Amino acid sequence: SEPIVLVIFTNKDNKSDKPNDKLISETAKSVMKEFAAAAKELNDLEKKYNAHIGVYALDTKSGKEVKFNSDKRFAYASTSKAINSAILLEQVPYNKLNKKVHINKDDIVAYSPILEKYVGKDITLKALIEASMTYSDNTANNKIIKEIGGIKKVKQRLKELGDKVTNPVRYEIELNYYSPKSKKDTSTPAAFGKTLNKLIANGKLSKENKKFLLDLMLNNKSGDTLIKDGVPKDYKVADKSGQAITYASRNDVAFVYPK
């Protein structure tokens, strides 16, 4: 069971529009229909929800790809939490994840339901990753980026994986201030999806780290209305969702195991 990598980014034309998660659900249902040997058009779904859909899906076994506006730019929001987690896990073995880092008042950013209790305390790298992936803790993600070496280093690792599209510029929460006239903190579905395959599904993580990460993603409840909602029952979905502040920017990325 090699997974299918699925990236769905959506947005709407107005700053203050609100997303409908059912759009991603329905998107996921249709695209998955493409991987068997019948399905609504993605166009019709854009019409039905009055929204823009960007999709990239790769069956890592066969190589087959499904693309729809696969090269348009979208704000990725908290879906980058997965990328940042993974990058740190390329560099720290499972058994050294009990290493502790000091958290102080200056590290704290908005929406840190886990980390706000550790001000002035030490937390392990594992709990950081848990916080970031399961609770979408913004302080945890920022500390993770710092542990990797800064935005600086993330950007250089993406270049090494051959992603010259994903453009990280700000930390949480400012990365969520998406503007369609700026490339800041955007990627395209194809770039991001290819990066997720090369970092996680088919990357250099150890089996323990890979497992640890994917377990977080499988057990995350924040994506139940999204791709998880759309694929049949029988499929395991490990996801990381996101939503930016503007233009109803609502996204989900996942590894889909049809078995």
Could you walk me through the main structural features you see in this protein, from its secondary elements to its overall organization?
The chain has one domain: Beta-lactamase (3-Layer(aba) Sandwich), CATH 3.40.710. Helix content is 36%, strand content 19%. It contains nine helices and nine strands. The strands form three sheets. Strands 3-2-1-9-8 form a five-stranded antiparallel sheet, with helices on both faces. It has a two-stranded antiparallel sheet with strand order 4-7. Strands 5-6 form a two-stranded antiparallel ribbon. A hairpin with a 6-residue loop joins strand 8 (236-243) and strand 9. The longest helix is centred in the last third of the chain and has 13 residues, at 189-201. The radius of gyration is 17 Å and the shape is globular. It comes from Staphylococcus aureus.
Q: Give, in order, the helices and strands.
A: EHHEEEHEEHHHEHHHEE
> Which shape, going by the Cα principal axes?
globular
Span from first to last CA? 6 Å
Major sheet description: 5 strands, antiparallel
The CATH homologous superfamily name equals DD-peptidase/beta-lactamase superfamily
Number of strands: 9
The helicity comes to: 25-40%
What portion of the residues fall into strands of 2 or more residues?
15-25%
CATH topology: Beta-lactamase
What is the CATH C level class, in words? Alpha Beta
The Cα radius of gyration reads 17 Å
**Domain unit count:** 1
Based on helices, strands and strand pairing, what is the structural class? alpha+beta
Which architecture per CATH? 3-Layer(aba) Sandwich
Number of helices: 9
